[PDB]
């Protein structure tokens, strides 16, 4: 439960970051036009968003489980860390524009 509570908080921060990146992306599209780089970053943001939605389903099932599988919890933890790195990389690509 302790490790699952932290994963829920990390997921919450990731959804908030993804939303703000959406508004930054759209703002950059206005300032610079639809450049091929922005189109690539939008495609990467849309993908990352879909993986974030999928892992929230895993959080919910693990929360409902009276004895949550440590293996599934560890799989979610590594997936959350990968998405945190992917989102931070996308944030840097956007800030560089």
Residue numbers in the entry: -1 to 95
Tell me what the authors wrote about this structure, in their words.
Here we describe the combination of rational and computational design to deliver three-helix bundle (3HB) peptide assemblies and single-chain proteins with control over topology and thermal stability. First, we garner sequence-to-structure relationships from antiparallel 3HBs in the Protein Data Bank. This gives core-packing rules, including layers of hydrogen-bonded polar residues, which are combined with surface-charge patterning to design complementary sequences for acidic (A), basic (B), and neutral (N) helices. Next, AlphaFold2 models for both designs are used to seed computational designs of single-chain proteins where the helices are connected by loop building. Synthetic genes for these express in E. coli to yield soluble, monomeric, and thermally stable proteins.
To alter thermal stability in our designs without compromising the 3HB fold and topology, we sought to destabilise sc-apCC3-CW1 systematically by modifying its consolidated, largely Leu-based hydrophobic core. For this section, this parent design with a single polar layer of Asn@a, Thr@d, and Thr@d (N-T-T) in the B, A, and N helices is referred to as sc-apCC3-CW-1NTT. As hydrophobic core packing is a key stabilising force in water-soluble globular proteins, we investigated whether introducing additional polar layers could attenuate core stability without compromising the overall 3HB structure. All sequences were evaluated using AF2, which consistently predicted clockwise 3HB topologies with high confidence. CD spectra showed a progressive decrease in helicity with the addition of N-T-T layers. Variable-temperature CD measurements revealed that sc-apCC3-CW with 0, 1, and 2 N-T-T layers were hyperthermally stable and did not unfold upon heating. By introducing polar residues into the hydrophobic core, we fine-tune thermal stability without compromising folding specificity.
